Amino acid sequence: PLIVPYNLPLPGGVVPRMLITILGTVKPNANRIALDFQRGNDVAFHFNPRFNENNRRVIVCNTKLDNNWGREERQSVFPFESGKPFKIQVLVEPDHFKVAVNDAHLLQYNHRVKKLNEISKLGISGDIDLTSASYTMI
């Protein structure tokens, strides 16, 4: 059990076959969660569950370059529940991030930021109790 916000170092950035696992529990009155894979100030991959955007639940993904958000990729399939334990797994592949939640595939996000070996931090924020954040190579 760790304090949020939390920054997990990714030394030398990410590489294909790297599997990042975030474990925690969604808070009971959760509104938002974010994962931010950063290259300096740039956000290579922002993964953002929203629990109440116009009274519905949505996953928003985007990239931030030079402090500007790009074109959003949205998904209505929403595997999180307020109050429940979750596992987010981000698998780095050569051309995309692949996300699975609770062992079920959720989405893919094509690499907009190309310098994977400079994506050297993961920020974790929002309405969760964070249990652990770690990575391994599959």
Ligand SMILES: CO[C@@H]1[C@@H](n2cc(-c3cc(F)c(F)c(F)c3)nn2)[C@@H](O)[C@@H](CO)O[C@H]1C(=O)N(c1cc(Cl)cc(Cl)c1)[C@H]1CCC[C@@H]1O
């Ligand atoms: C509130 O800003 C959103 C961004 N964001 C979220 C968080 C955040 C999340 C957490 F879970 C958390 F815990 C935390 F601490 C911080 N920090 N930054 C990002 O989530 C960003 C992703 O595109 O969206 C921003 C956004 O809400 N919009 C937005 C989209 C674009 Cl492209 C351009 C601008 Cl100027 C705005 C709206 C406008 C209308 C529809 C669109 O979705």
